[PDB]
From a paper:
The final model includes 643 residues in two protein molecules (A and B), two CHES molecules, three glycerol molecules, one sulfate ion and 394 water molecules in the asymmetric unit. The two chains are nearly identical, with an r.m.s.d. of 0.30 Å over 320 Cα atoms (0.60 Å over all 2524 equivalent atoms). The C-terminal domain (residues 221–352) is arranged perpendicular to the long axis of the N-terminal barrel and comprises ten β-strands. In the NE1406 crystal structure, the two lipocalin-like barrels lack the large internal cavity that is typical of lipocalins and also the long structurally flexible loops at the open end of the β-barrel. In fact, only one of the β-­barrel domains of NE1406 harbors a small glycerol molecule from the crystallization solution as a ligand. However, the complete internalization of the glycerol molecule in the NE1406 structure suggests that the N-terminal lipocalin-like barrel might adopt different conformations in the presence of a natural ligand. We therefore propose that this region, which encompasses the calycin signature, acts as a ligand-binding site, the shape and accessibility of which may change with natural ligands. The two barrels are stabilized in a perpendicular orientation with respect to each other. The mainly aromatic and hydrophobic residues implicated in the interaction with CHES are highly or strictly conserved among DUF2006 homologs, suggesting that the domain interface plays a functional role. As with the glycerol molecule bound within the N-terminal barrel, the CHES molecule is also fully enclosed within NE1406 with no exposure to solvent, suggesting some flexibility at the interdomain interface to accommodate ligands.
Author numbering: 24 to 74, 83 to 351
Write the structure that this text describes.
């Protein structure tokens, strides 16, 4: 029901909780891990809600992945449930999100705990904030297209410290890491002339946080674009669509879907050039059989004007 309009200030801790009066809501976690041997792994977790004893009226959709270069492709799992019916089974509420056993919870102290038991791995993590949260756009009002209604309320928690345990092959391993949380809600999806989006975020080594995206038209026009850099002084610089562009360095073709992705790319935010290198090429996640789509969810490293800068994720949609 509820529209996204400017001049509405976010308030915390209230706006950590679900926004069940809106049509759509996202909880998106991306990060890098380190095992006891020093080996890196990437992971991501998505929950997405959109709006009777069996009828699919309100829905919670989720997917998870682990990126291990030793495997060379994702290990992933994906689920969807009807929400509103059995809050014990599937719900988005004041402190958590739950789909079957998959759960994501915010503690009173601000720490996130999550247990995600998938087919080939389990993630049991604590994600501990280290910085103030980062409002996107204009104090959380973040535009995603030229139309007046084409906007989201949107913030991020960058530089989440990761602790906890991954189970794989029935073997518990403790990990450390750093992660990023996006929180977005709206009553309108992207314009349907959009083929898809490209999104990146980066936990930069100096403490800075970067997020950017573009919306791709089916005609290969740039429907919209955005970026925000919060520097080590805590100042956020915002970039207009004019100032953000994407420039592939290298493409990879999926043998599963035949889609062709810019897995390595250069992203310009004003006069600053960020280069994105993938941990591995095949980070494609096909969730179509759980009412999803084919996404590239890949852990990537960033350089800035040619120097090492940090680590993060890149998500690419609408390439099939």
């Amino acid at each position: 029901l509820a529209p996204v309009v400017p001049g509405k200030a976010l308030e915390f801790p209230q706006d950590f909780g679900a926004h069940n009066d809106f049509r759509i809501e996202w909880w998106y976690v991306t990060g890098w891990l380190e095992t006891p041997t020093g080996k890196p792994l990437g992971f991501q977790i998505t929950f997405f809600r959109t709006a009777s004893h069996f009828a699919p009226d309100q829905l919670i959709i989720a997917h998870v992945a682990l990126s291990d270069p030793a495997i060379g492709k994702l290990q992933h799992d994906q689920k969807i449930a009807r929400a509103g019916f059995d809050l014990a089974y599937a719900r988005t509420g004041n402190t958590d999100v739950k789909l079957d056993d998959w759960i994501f919870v915010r503690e009173t102290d601000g720490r996130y705990r999550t247990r995600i038991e998938a087919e080939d791995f389990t993630l049991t993590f604590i994600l501990t904030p280290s910085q103030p949260l980062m409002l996107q756009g204009e104090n959380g009002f973040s535009r995603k297209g030229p139309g007046a209604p084409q906007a989201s309320y949107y913030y991020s928690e960058p530089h989440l410290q990761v602790s906890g345990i991954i189970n794989r092959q029935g073997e518990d391993i403790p990990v450390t890491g750093t992660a990023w949380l996006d929180r977005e809600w709206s009553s309108e999806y992207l314009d349907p002339n959009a083929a898809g989006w490209d999104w990146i975020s980066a936990n930069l080594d100096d403490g800075s946080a970067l997020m950017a995206f573009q919306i791709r038209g089916k005609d290969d026009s740039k429907i919209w674009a955005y970026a925000a850099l919060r520097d080590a002084s805590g100042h956020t610089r915002l970039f207009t669509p004019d100032q953000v562009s994407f420039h592939p360095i290298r493409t990879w073709r999926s043998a599963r879907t035949q889609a062709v992705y810019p897995v390595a790319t250069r992203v310009l935010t004003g006069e600053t050039e960020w280069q994105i290198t993938p941990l591995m090429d095949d980070q494609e996640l096909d969730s179509r059989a759980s009412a999803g789509a084919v996404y590239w969810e890949g852990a990537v490293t960033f350089t800035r004007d040619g120097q090492p800068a940090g680590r993060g994720y890149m998500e690419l949609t609408g390439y099939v």
